[PDB]
Design a protein around this ligand. Structure first.
Ligand SMILES: O=[N+]([O-])c1ccc(O)c([N+](=O)[O-])c1
Ligand SMILES: O=[N+]([O-])c1ccc(O)c([N+](=O)[O-])c1
Ligand SMILES: O=[N+]([O-])c1ccc(O)c([N+](=O)[O-])c1
Ligand SMILES: O=[N+]([O-])c1ccc(O)c([N+](=O)[O-])c1
Ligand SMILES: *[C@H]1O[C@H](CO)[C@@H](O)[C@H](O)[C@H]1F
Ligand SMILES: *[C@H]1O[C@H](CO)[C@@H](O)[C@H](O)[C@H]1F
Ligand SMILES: *[C@H]1O[C@H](CO)[C@@H](O)[C@H](O)[C@H]1F
Ligand SMILES: *[C@H]1O[C@H](CO)[C@@H](O)[C@H](O)[C@H]1F
Lengths: 486, 486, 486, 486
C-alpha cells in the first residue's frame, strides 16, 4: 500500500507565481557518455569505474550513460515536451580542460555552446553547475585533487573559462553541487570517487583518513567557491544580470524521541548536513557545533577568507529527498568517532522512538517519503539564515531495476505522487513566507546513479537502454506536460 | 529615577495558594559569629579572612557577624514578626565536627537543636542547607578539601550526622548552595575561600588552575550530593515525609543581539550557569555543550554515578538576582580560555546591542533589576526539565554602605519594589503552569557578604552594628508583615 | 558601540514587489539657493534668516544652500547613479508667484519644468510637494500668512498654477509636508519661520499665542488642502491617472511604563502627533481626544468642510525618524498648558521607566534609532484607518558637523545601517499586510536643516561646501546603487 | 421564543472551588418595612414616596415591603433552604440613628444583631452594605444630604457605629452600593430620592442641576468611603480578618458599529459607568476621560484624599444585569450636555448597527440578556485594574406583574436560565484567570423595586402579598437547593 494524494490535493501551476520556475536537473558524468571523445580528459569518476569497477553495484559505468554528448537535442526536446522553463546541467571540467589546467578543448566548449543555444532556441533557461564531483584525474594524479590547495586556483581558472565561454548566455550558476555528500562518500566512507577512507575500512583506497580528509576537501571547496565568486562579481557581471550560488544536499531531521537531548541532536544533524557548507557562505565560518566537536581537524579561515565567503551566494540550491530521526549520542570515554559523520554526535535513524519508519519507502532503500521535512528546512532558511532566494535544485525518487512492484518503467505513479507532495510542500513554505523561486526535479532522464549504476532510475523521462538509449516520457513527465499547460 | 510598581500591581498573599511558602534565607558563616567558641573548628572562610584580610573589601570578617550563635532568638522573632512560614538556614560543618571528621561537637549540635526547636515553637518550618561554602579548614589542610575525592565520603558522614541529629524535626534539605558561584569564585577567579587561581592571576593563592580546579571541585560536589541523597533515601526517610535537593545560582540570559549566533550563545550561558549542576541531577551527566567545549578538563561519571545522580532531587532551589545579555564568542586560533567561565564561549554583558543596560541598578554593581529573566528560567524548568518542584531559595538586593541615594538603611523602598516585582514574576510563571512552591528572600538579616563584608546590606531586617547588633525591621520587612496578614 | 545588522539581515531589492518605489526627498528652501534671482519673491524663511540670523545654530541660511537652482542636473545624476525610481521635491511658492498671488514668474516655472523634464529623460518619476514651510513673505506681510483664512484661497490658486504648469507630466502630489512640525515649531515654540510664540517665551517674535496660533495655522492648512484637492479632482484629473495626498510627520510611541494610564497617554500622543492632521483627511474632523482637551482653541469644521476633508487623500506620506516614550500627565488644579503640545497631557520621554533610552543616538540629539516604532505606526494605518496607500516620504539621520565619531562625511555606515533597518521594518509591515508603496530617504543631498543650518548633514550624497558645492556619493548612496542593481 | 441552555451546559457546583461563595442580596428600604417603628427615623426614600407617591409606577411604597423587620427569620430560612453560604443585606442608617447623627436607636441595633445571629446560627455568612440609597431625611433637611460635605463625617460616624455594633461577627463590608446609578437617578434624571434635576426637566424637584449635582454627590460618597475605610483599618480590624470594599453597578458595552470611533466611545462608556467610582478607589482620581470632558463640574481631590482613596478596597462588588451598544457622539458647536450621562459623549443603544437588539428581553424593559458582557468586564478587572477580588454582588432579572407570558410567579424558568448563563459566564472568567470569589443573586425575595414598586419581581423566593407576605420558593430557588446539594 502507498497512499496517493486525493485529486483535489494535487498541485496546479497557478498555485505558484508566474515568475516561479519549474525545471529538471542532470549532471555531466551521469548522462553525457563520450568519456574519451574529441580530446576529453579522464575524470576521477572515469578512473574510479575503470580501476575499481566492482564498486558499482550493477557492474556498469558512465562511459556512455544516456549518450547526451550526442543526443542532447533529445534532452532539450523532452524538457520542451514537459513544458519545463529551466534546465540545470553541469559542465564536465575534463571535457573542456583535459588536463585540469592549460589549453581549452574547443570541441568540449562547442558542445556546451550547442546545448546552451538549443535550450535558448527552445525557450528554456540554462542554469549551470560548474562542478558536479567530476574532477580531472590529471589534477587528482598531480596533487591529490581537492585534498591540496592547488585545487583552489585550478578551479578558479576552470570557472573563469566557463564565465568567458558561456556567460553572455548563461546568467545563473552554481559553483558546486552537494559538497557534504561528496566529502562524506568520497573521503569518509570512500564509496565514491576517488574512493578514499581510513586504513581498515572497506573502500577502494583505504589509505586516507575518514576523520580528516572530508574536512580538508570541504575546506578547499569553500575556498574555491569564494575565489570564483569574487572573480565573477568583479569581472563577469558587467550588466549586473547574473547570479551565482552553491547547491547543498539536505535531509530533514526530527528528534528521535521527545527529549531536549534529541532536540539538541537534531540541531547538530542539521548543522552537520546543511550548515557545514551553508553557514560558511552565510557568515564566513563553519557552525559553532562543528568547530567545538571537530577542533584541529576542521581548518580555520583567515579573515580575508571569512569576508570573501560571507554573503557569497545570490541564490542557494537545496537538493532534498528525504528526512531522518536524529538521536543524541553522548560524549563519553568509551566512544570515539571513526567516520567524519560521527563528529555530529547524532545518529540518523530511519525509525523513530515509537518504532515507526519516518515515512513510506519509495524504491531505493534510502528515500523515505517525508515532504514535511522540506517545508521545515525552508522555514529555517527563512527564519535563521535571512530568507535568501532558494531553488529546489534536486528532488525525486528512484525506481529500482527488477523491483516486482515497479514492473513497468513508464508507469511511475509513485514518483508522480512524491513529486506532487513535494511541490505542495514547497507551496506550504511559500504561503508561510519562504522565498522559494523554483523546483527542479532530479532527474530529467534516467542516468548513471554513481555507486548504484543504472539500476536506480531517477528520470521523468525513461532512457530505453534496449532501444538505442531512446527518450520516452513516463507518466510523471506527461503530468508535467499538462501541469505546464503544453 | 527608579520607577516603582503602580499600587494596583503590588502582589497580594492570595495571589498564591494556601500551601505556597514565603520565607527568608541566611547562611552560617554569614550571620553566626562565635567563630571559635564552644569547641568549633575553623572553616576555610575563617582561615581565608584571617590569612588574607585584604581580600574583604571593607576590612571585615565573620568572626562575629550578626552574632546569631547567641542572638538566634531575635532571628526567629523577626521571621515571626514578618509572618514568614519558612526559614532556610545552613549548618556550619566546622561547628558540629571541628575536624571535618570524627567526634561530634555536642555544643554545636545543641545550638542547631535550639534554633530548630525555637522555630517550631513559633510555627516556622526549618529548611536546612547542609553546606554553604563553609568547609572545615582541617579537611582543606589535610587533602585540599573539595579538590580531593576524600571530600566525598567526609561530606557523606557530615550529612549523616545532620540527618541523625536533626531529621526527626527537619524534613527539607538542600545538600549544597550555589555550586557554580562557589566553583567560579573560589577556584576560578579565586576571590572566595580558599582563594585559588592560575599562576599569574590576581588572587590570594595563585598556585591553582582556573581551567581545571573549578571542574574538579564541582565534580566532587556532585558525587558528594549523590552519596548523601542515596544514604538519605535508604536510611533517613522511613516516614517518606522528607525531601532533599540542591540550590543553584542562576542568571537569566537574553541574546545580546538578534542573531542565531547569540541565540546559540544564550543556550551555552544557561548550560554553563545553570545546567553545570542541574543537568547532572536531572540526567546524570553535564550538558553536552560543556563536555564538547571542556573535554578532558571535565571529569567523566561512572555508570553507577550517572544513575545515582539522575533524579536525585525531590526539590530544587533557584537563587536568582539578575540577568545578562549573552554574546557569542567564536572558536578561533587567536583565542584561548583563561578562566573556567571562558569555556562557554559566551560573554555575559550588562549592556545589549542597542547600547541599553539590561534593567536598572539596584545598589551593588552586579544586581541589575530584570524580573522577566526569572519567569523565563522558571518556564525552562517546566518545559525542558520536567517541571520539578521549585523553591526560589534566594532573591533580593544590596544597599551599599555610604551610597548617598540610600541614606536611611531602614527606608528600603527599592528592595521592597524589587521583591514585589519578583514575587509578581513568580506569579506569572505559576499562572503559565510552573511548579513553584515558595519564595525565600535573601537575606533575613544584614550579614557578611563575602568579599564585600558588611558593606553590602541584603536584609529585610537591619542589623544595627552601632547598637549591639540589634535587629530592626526595615520598610520591606513591615510590608511582609502586612502581606502575611500578621 | 553602535551595533550593525548581521550581513544576512540586510534588505535586498527583491524583498519588495517590482512596483514598489525607492526614492529620496528634498525641499525648495533647503537646496535651491538663488533666493532672489530671476524675479523670485522672498519667503518667510528668507525673511526669518535675514531678520533673525541668530536663530540658525551655525550662523548660516538658505541664500545659496546646495545651489540646486543652478545645479539640478547634478541632483538628477546622483538619483540616477543610486538607481532611485522616484524623486520627491517641493515647489517654491515664492519663486513661481513672487507676491503669493497674481502674475506667475515664467523663469520660476521654467526651472521646475527643466527639473521635471530632466527627471523624465532619466527615467525618474517626479513626486511633488506643493508647500514645504515655504510661504511668500508678501502674504505673511499682507495678512499674517497661515493665520488668516485668506491663505486658503491664495494657496488654492498656487496649487492650481502647479496643476496647470506641471500636471501633464507630474502625476503624484502632496499638498503639504509636516503640518504638525510646522505648527508646533513655527507658532508654538516659534524656533521656525515666521518665529512666533506667546509673550514671555524665547522666540524671535514673542507676540503670538502658543496655545492658539498653532491650531489656527493648522486649521487653515486643512481647509487649504480640502479646497486644492476638490479643485484637482474636478478639473485636473481628466485621465484619472493622478494622485494627491498629504505627508505627515510621525513619531512612534511606547508607553513610558506598564500602566493603563500610559497606554491612554500613548494613544493621546499619537492623536496629537499624527491624528491632528490625518484624522481630518480620514473622517473630516480632529481626534476626539484633541477636541476634548483643546475645546474653543480648536476651530470647528462646517459640514461642507467635513465632507470635503473626509477621504481627501489618494495617498499618504509618513515622514518617520524616531520614537518616544509617552508618559501620562494628570488633569489637575496645579497644571496649565503653555505650549500647544502640552494639550496632549502626555510628555514625550527619550528614556523609559526602566531608565533606558528608547534606542541608540544616531548623531543629532533628537534621532534615536527605533525601527519598530515605524512598523507599529504602519499597522495602525492598516487596522484603524483603512489601510490607505502609504509612502515613507522621509526617513534618515543626520551626521553632525565636527562630531569626532563621524570624521569622514562620506563614510556614513551609521546612516546606511539605520536606513537598512528601516527598510527592513517596512518589509515587516508589508508582510503583515500594510499597504506601503515606497521609501524615500531624507535627504537626497546634504541641505539646510532649518534651525540647525548645514551643521546637520542628512544626505545620501555629500555636498562639498569647500569644493564648489560638488555632489559626492557617500557609502550609503553606493549601497543603494548596488541594491537598485545599477 | 426564549432559548434555554442545553442540559449538559447547566453549571454544577463543582465548576467552582470549595471556597467560592453563592449567596443572594437585598437592601433595607426594599424589604424591611416597619418604616416608623421602634424609634426609626424617616429616610429620603420614606419622604420621597410619602411626598411624591405618583413617582412610583404602581402607586406603592416601602412602608411595609416584605416586612422583613418582623419576618427576617423567614428570609434566613429561605437562604438555608436554597443552601446559600452568604447573605448580603444593608443597614438602614435611619433605623439605627433616627436623626442621622447622635443617639443610637437600641431597638434598631437589636434588629440587626438578631438577623446577624440568626444567620450565623444557620451557617450563613453576613456581608453587609452600610449604605444603600437610604439617607436619613434629617440630614437631607439639615444640609441637603450628599450634596454637602458635612455628609462625610456624618457617614463616618454611622459606619463606625456599624463597626462597633456588628464587627465582632460581621467581617465583610461594602461602604456604598451603586454610586453611579444613585448619582444619575437621584440627581440627574431625578426619578429616585431625593428626586432632583435641572429646572425644566420632569422630576419631583426640578430645582437642582443635572450637570453638577450628580458629581457633587458622587465626590462626597468617595470622600465618605475613604474616611470610613481609613477608620476601619486603623481601629476595627485588630485580628486582620475583616475586609471592606464598595459595590459598583456596571453595564457591559460593545461598540455600536465596527469603527475606531465606537471603540473609543465604548471605552468612554465604561469609564463613565464603571470607572467613575472604581478608578478613584484604584488610583485615587477619576478617569482621565471624565476630567477632560466634565472639567470644573468634577471636583478635584486633595493629595491626602488621593492617597486615602487609592487601594481603599480589599474586595469589590460588581452588580451586573445587562449590556449596551456604545455609539460615538461628536464634540460639536450644535451639541451641549443636559444630563450628567451626556458627558460620556457615547449614547447607550439597545440595538446595534446591524439593527439587532443586543440580547433577548427578560421581562423589565431594561434587562436584555448578554452574559458575555459580564465575562468581558471581569477580564478588564483582571488585565487593567490588577485583578482584585471580585464578588458579583447583584445579578438577576424581573418578572413584570401582569405580563401574560409570566402568568405563574413561581414558574421562573426564565430567571433560572439567565442565572445559569451568568454563573457559567463567571466560570468562563475564572478559567481565563479572573479572581471572582462569589455570586450573589439579586434578589433573595421579591421586594420594592424603587420607581417600579412591587410590580417588578426580582426574587428567587416569591413574596405572596395576598397571603400575608409569605415566602414561597420559586423554580429558580429549588434549582439552587439542588445545585448547593441541600
Ligand atoms: O545519501 N544521501 O543523503 C544522498 C544525498 C544526495 C545524493 O546524491 C546521494 N547519492 O548520490 O548517493 C545520497
Ligand atoms: O555574581 N553572582 O552571579 C553571584 C551569584 C550569587 C552570589 O551569592 C554571589 N556572591 O555571593 O557574590 C554572586
Ligand atoms: O522634532 N521632530 O519630530 C521633527 C520632525 C520632523 C522635522 O522635520 C523636524 N525638523 O525639521 O526639525 C523635527
Ligand atoms: O438602569 N440601570 O443600569 C440600573 C442599574 C442598577 C439598578 O439598581 C437600577 N435600578 O434600581 O433601577 C438600574
Ligand atoms: C543529487 O542526488 C541524486 C540522487 O541521488 C544524484 O544522482 C545526483 O548526482 C546528486 F547531485
Ligand atoms: C546567595 O547570594 C547572596 C547574595 O550575593 C549571598 O550572600 C549568599 O551567600 C548566596 F548563597
Ligand atoms: C523632514 O525632516 C527633515 C529632517 O529634520 C527636514 O529637513 C525636512 O524639511 C522635513 F520635511
Ligand atoms: C441593584 O439593582 C437592583 C435591580 O434594579 C435594585 O433593586 C437594587 O436596589 C440595586 F442595588
Amino acid at each position: 500500500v502507498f497512499t496517493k494524494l486525493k485529486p483535489w490535493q494535487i498541485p496546479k501551476r497557478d498555485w505558484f507565481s508566474k515568475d516561479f520556475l519549474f525545471g529538471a536537473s542532470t549532471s555531466a558524468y551521469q548522462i553525457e557518455g563520450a568519456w574519451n571523445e574529441d580530446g576529453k580528459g579522464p575524470s576521477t569518476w572515469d578512473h574510479f569505474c575503470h580501476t575499481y569497477p566492482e564498486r558499482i553495484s550493477d557492474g556498469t559505468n558512465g562511459d556512455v550513460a544516456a549518450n547526451s554528448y550526442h543526443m542532447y537535442e533529445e534532452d532539450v526536446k523532452a524538457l520542451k515536451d514537459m513544458g519545463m522553463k529551466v534546465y540545470r546541467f553541469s559542465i564536465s571540467w575534463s571535457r573542456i580542460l583535459p588536463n585540469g589546467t592549460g589549453k581549452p578543448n574547443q570541441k568540449g566548449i562547442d558542445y556546451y555552446n550547442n546545448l546552451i543555444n538549443s535550450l535558448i532556441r527552445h525557450g528554456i533557461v540554462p542554469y549551470v553547475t560548474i562542478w558536479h564531483w567530476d574532477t580531472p584525474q590529471a589534477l587528482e594524479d598531480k596533487y591529490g585533487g581537492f585534498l591540496d590547495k592547488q585545487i583552489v586556483n585550478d578551479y578558479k581558472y576552470f570557472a573563469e573559462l566557463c564565465f568567458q565561454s558561456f556567460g553572455d548566455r548563461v546568467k545563473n550558476w552554481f559553483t558546486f553541487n552537494e559538497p557534504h555528500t561528496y566529502c562524506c562518500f568520497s573521503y569518509g566512507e570512500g564509496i565514491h570517487a576517488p574512493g578514499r577512507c581510513s586504513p581498515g575500512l572497506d573502500c577502494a583506497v583505504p589509505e586516507g583518513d575518514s576523520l580528516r580528509e572530508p574536512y580538508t576537501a570541504g575546506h578547499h571547496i569553500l575556498l574555491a567557491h569564494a575565489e570564483a565568486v569574487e572573480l565573477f562579481k568583479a569581472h563577469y557581471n558587467k550588466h549586473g544580470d547574473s547570479k551565482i550560488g552553491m547547491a547543498f544536499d539536505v535531509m530533514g531531521y526530527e528528534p528521535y524521541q521527545d527529549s531536549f537531548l534529541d532536540d539538541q541532536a537534531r540541531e547538530r544533524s542539521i548543522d552537520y548536513n546543511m550548515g557545514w557548507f551553508l553557514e560558511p557562505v552565510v557568515r564566513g565560518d563553519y557552525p559553532f557545533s562543528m568547530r567545538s566537536l571537530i577542533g584541529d581537524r576542521l581548518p580555520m579561515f583567515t579573515k580575508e577568507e571569512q569576508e570573501k565567503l560571507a554573503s557569497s551566494c545570490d541564490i542557494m540550491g537545496l537538493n532534498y529527498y528525504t528526512s531522518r530521526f536524529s538521536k543524541h549520542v553522548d560524549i563519553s570515554s568509551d566512544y570515539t568517532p571513526t567516520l567524519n559523520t560521527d563528529d555530529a554526535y547524532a545518529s540518523s535513524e530511519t525509525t523513530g522512538s515509537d518504532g515507526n519508519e519516518i515515512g513510506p519507502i519509495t524504491g531505493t532503500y534510502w528515500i523515505y517519503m517525508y515532504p514535511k521535512g522540506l517545508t521545515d528546512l525552508l522555514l529555517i532558511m527563512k527564519e535563521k539564515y535571512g530568507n535568501p532566494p532558494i531553488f529546489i535544485t534536486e528532488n525525486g525518487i528512484a525506481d529500482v531495476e527488477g523491483d516486482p512492484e515497479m514492473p513497468d518503467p513508464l508507469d511511475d505513479w509513485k514518483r508522480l505522487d512524491y513529486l506532487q507532495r513535494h511541490i505542495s510542500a514547497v507551496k506550504d513554505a511559500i504561503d508561510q513566507g519562504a522565498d522559494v523561486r523554483g523546483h527542479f526535479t532530479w532527474g530529467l532522464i534516467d542516468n548513471f546513479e554513481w555507486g548504484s549504476g543504472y539500476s536506480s532510475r531517477f528520470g521523468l523521462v525513461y532512457i530505453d537502454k534496449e532501444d538505442g538509449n531512446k527518450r520516452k516520457l513516463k507518466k510523471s513527465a506527461k503530468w508535467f506536460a499538462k501541469f505546464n499547460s503544453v
